[PDB]
Amino acid sequence: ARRRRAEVRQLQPDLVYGDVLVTAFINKIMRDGKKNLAARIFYDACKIIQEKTGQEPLKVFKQAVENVKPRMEVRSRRVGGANYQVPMEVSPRRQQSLALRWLVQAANQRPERRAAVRIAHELMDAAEGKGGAVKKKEDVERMAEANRAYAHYRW
Amino acid sequence: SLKKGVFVDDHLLEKVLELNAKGEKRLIKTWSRRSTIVPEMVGHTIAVYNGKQHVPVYITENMVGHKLGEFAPTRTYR
Amino acid sequence: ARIAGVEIPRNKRVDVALTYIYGIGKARAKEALEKTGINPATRVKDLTEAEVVRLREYVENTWKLEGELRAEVAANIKRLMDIGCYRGLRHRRGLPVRGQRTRTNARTRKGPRKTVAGKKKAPR
Amino acid sequence: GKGDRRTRRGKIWRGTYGKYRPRK
Amino acid sequence: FAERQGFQVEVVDLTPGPEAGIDYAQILVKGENAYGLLSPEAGVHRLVRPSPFDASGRRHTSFAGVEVIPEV
RNA sequence: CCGGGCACUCUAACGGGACUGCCCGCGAAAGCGGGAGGAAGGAGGGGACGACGUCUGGUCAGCAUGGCCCUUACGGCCUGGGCGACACACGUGCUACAAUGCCCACUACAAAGCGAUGCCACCCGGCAACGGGGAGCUAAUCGCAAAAAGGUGGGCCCAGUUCGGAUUGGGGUCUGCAACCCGACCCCAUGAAGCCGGAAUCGCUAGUAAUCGCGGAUCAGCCAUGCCGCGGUGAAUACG
RNA sequence: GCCCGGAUAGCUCAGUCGGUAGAGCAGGGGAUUGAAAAUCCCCGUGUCCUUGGUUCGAUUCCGAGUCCGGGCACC
RNA sequence: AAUUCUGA
Ligand SMILES: [Mg+2]
């Protein structure tokens, strides 16, 4: 990617919610391109939402995905024999990708044997500011700021 | 695995057969490791060819369905 | 319920329990079940003495399973250890006897790797 | 799995037919 | 050679070294009438082959000595 | 499925169209950015094609051929053994450690190729592999053939297990004169290690990676998980 | 024998100047190098050897018991 | 801030 600034592939709007983002989240739950056996789980989670909080799985998204967005993380560099892993801002685009990813991984960690349960629950704890995905958020934010010593390295 | 027959070479019977009448000596050289040892043969030792030389292998009850090649090793020091 | 030998499986379907017996698998499972009107989707947790002893019938009476098959299987191998046929050996030596690649993969019937080596590539 | 010779895919991956995959 | 004729080997000494080859090799071979068989092979044996330890692969020559002394 | 019909689908043959031609921004031009129109843009996506030359690379064992060597054997034939040998060690691959799962029952959608001592519709026996009969097919007209994952509903409920299938014991079918070495499948019983893997390390920027199945070649049969093609679903990231 | 102090994280030590328990090093996960550390974030672990009395009760306030640490003699 | 490759 040395010539062109690459291209931001387009997300097809959801086919139930109509969100170009409610799909980006399913895509990460898609193993082997089986979007049917993936979106199913997701939609089976939205029913665990409406069956454990009148809150429509919509604000449980715009909130759990917003309380996970890391403002700044660490991206290492080397000026020459310099093992400086500088902290810096995050591209609004990147933020989302890092979020969704940590959300799936975290989901895939809970002890719930089924699946949608895990996604639903992790979405609840993350909206309610206390999910394993946010644990990685603060963990990442600790590294950040704590190294503001390298502020003159904003490449 | 065979299904209709016992694919036992010509010279096998032709030879052995006369040897069964009164129970002859024993020394019966061979090159038919691809056969079978049907009963009545008991006692009569056969000089099976392992590819290099003749092995004086004795015959007893238990060993029946087995073949001649499953009694003359082809490699050494296993 | 002490069914065959010393095996008391519970909390599971009375169709997989028989599998946990040396000499019984999926086959003979959904076999003694049809030949005894015993619904497979039930449990050892609840079953009439009749179903037990009846099971002990079409099981411990049909094919004489652990101990005695075990005793026979070894007896056959023991027979292969009479004069020593080709199958007899390779068994006497504890190796596989089904025409297989021994130059590599075979740790199953090979007694773990004993890296006992020593070849070289560059002295003085 | 694709090596369990006593199932559906057991024969699919194998390319044969048996008691565990009769001829339609 | 001494394992084909039937004789028995004892590696009294073998020692590697820096890059590749061998520094010193002292072996004891037994069996009936053994010295008389390895007595003629007592000298310096020359080799001529493409050098593997070269980039161009040039044709090179190598020398190595073989001494023989019985156990009296 | 009938007669009947070329409007579709498709099949194969010849053409159009895209060229930075049209608008606007930059530049002297070349050229670049963006916008529209258009099914399609700035080499639209793939092939095929790979310069003077390097590597005294590899290939006398595909063939040819200089030169050296043997010619009642360094040639010719034959039964049989060996190339498959295992205390070890490295590479490419296959199946897995599982619940986005496995097993069970029912029902659907492809493409590319391939079939006369050849592929086999459908019955009957055998749980089956497989065996009888026999029709159709020189094949856009009959068959190989069911695609699979999936959709669908019923039970397992996290235990090395209904996961995983190595190994071993018993029984059979099929080619082939002949399956001990040394074949492929069928059934029963065996159910070992493996709970994502130290140091290191491989591929891919899009219908790509991953996953799923189908065909062909050689060939009596096959150790093909290899190779060459075909198609179903179908991502993340690229600041620099 | 007399005079003084003290064990609490694997180790070393602070501490309502009475309720509310803590640091450094060890250790683990990650982060992690061209290679180990140096950078870098996050957690479990207890009557403070310890015998109690006042205090509402005490890791800290009295006696005092066991041992530990440091000094002072005589013989 | 990290050595070496003989001799056709
Ligand atoms: Mg040197």
Curated annotation (Swiss-Prot), chain A:
GO terms, molecular function: rRNA binding; structural constituent of ribosome; tRNA binding
Keywords: Ribonucleoprotein, Ribosomal protein, RNA-binding, rRNA-binding, tRNA-binding
Cited Pfam families: Ribosomal_S7
Record carries keyword Amino-acid biosynthesis: no
SUPFAM superfamilies, A to Z: Ribosomal protein S7
NCBIfam families: rpsG_bact (TIGR01029)
Function text: One of the primary rRNA binding proteins, it binds directly to 16S rRNA where it nucleates assembly of the head domain of the 30S subunit. Is located at the subunit interface close to the decoding center, probably blocks exit of the E-site tRNA.
Protein name: Small ribosomal subunit protein uS7
Gene expressing this chain: rpsG
From Swiss-Prot, chain B:
GO MF assignments: rRNA binding; structural constituent of ribosome
GO annotation (BP), single: translation
This protein's UniProt keywords: Ribonucleoprotein, Ribosomal protein, RNA-binding, rRNA-binding
Superkingdom in the source lineage: Bacteria
Any one cellular-component term (Gene Ontology): cytoplasm
Protein family per UniProt: Belongs to the universal ribosomal protein uS19 family.
Entry function: Protein S19 forms a complex with S13 that binds strongly to the 16S ribosomal RNA.
Descriptive protein name: Small ribosomal subunit protein uS19
Species the sequence originates in: Thermus thermophilus
From Swiss-Prot, chain C:
InterPro entries named among the record's database cross-references: Rbsml_uS13_C, Ribosomal_uS13, Ribosomal_uS13-like_H2TH, Ribosomal_uS13_bac-type, Ribosomal_uS13_CS
Keyword list, A-Z: Ribonucleoprotein, Ribosomal protein, RNA-binding, rRNA-binding, tRNA-binding
PROSITE patterns cross-referenced by the UniProt entry: RIBOSOMAL_S13_1, RIBOSOMAL_S13_2
Complexes and interactors: Part of the 30S ribosomal subunit. Forms a loose heterodimer with protein S19. Forms two bridges to the 50S subunit in the 70S ribosome.
Family that this chain belongs to: Belongs to the universal ribosomal protein uS13 family.
The protein's name: Small ribosomal subunit protein uS13
Keyword ATP-binding found: no
Organism of provenance: Thermus thermophilus (strain ATCC BAA-163 / DSM 7039 / HB27)
Gene Ontology cellular-component annotations: cytosol; small ribosomal subunit
Function recorded in the entry: Located at the top of the head of the 30S subunit, it contacts several helices of the 16S rRNA. In the 70S ribosome it contacts the 23S rRNA (bridge B1a) and protein L5 of the 50S subunit (bridge B1b), connecting the 2 subunits; these bridges are implicated in subunit movement. Contacts the tRNAs in the A and P-sites.
GO annotation, biological process: translation
Record lineage: Bacteria, Thermotogati, Deinococcota, Deinococci, Thermales
Positions of the UniProt region annotated as Disordered: 94-124
Gene Ontology molecular function: rRNA binding; structural constituent of ribosome; tRNA binding
The keyword rRNA-binding belongs to this UniProt entry's keyword annotation: yes
From Swiss-Prot, chain D:
Annotated region (Disordered), positions in chain: 1-24
Alphabetical keyword list: Ribonucleoprotein, Ribosomal protein, RNA-binding, rRNA-binding
InterPro entries the UniProt entry points to: Ribosomal_bTHX, Ribosomal_bTHX/bTHXc/bTHXm
Signal peptide: none
Biased composition (Basic residues): 1-12
GO CC, any one term: ribosome
Coiled-coil spans in chain: none
GO MF annotations, alphabetized: rRNA binding
Source domain of life: Bacteria
NCBIfam families: PRK14753.1 (NF011339), ribo_THX (TIGR04560)
Assembly mode: Part of the 30S ribosomal subunit.
Summary of the function given for this chain in its UniProt record: Binds at the top of the head of the 30S subunit. It stabilizes a number of different RNA elements and thus is important for subunit structure.
Family statement: Belongs to the bacterial ribosomal protein bTHX family.
Protein name, UniProt field: Small ribosomal subunit protein bTHX
Organism: Thermus thermophilus
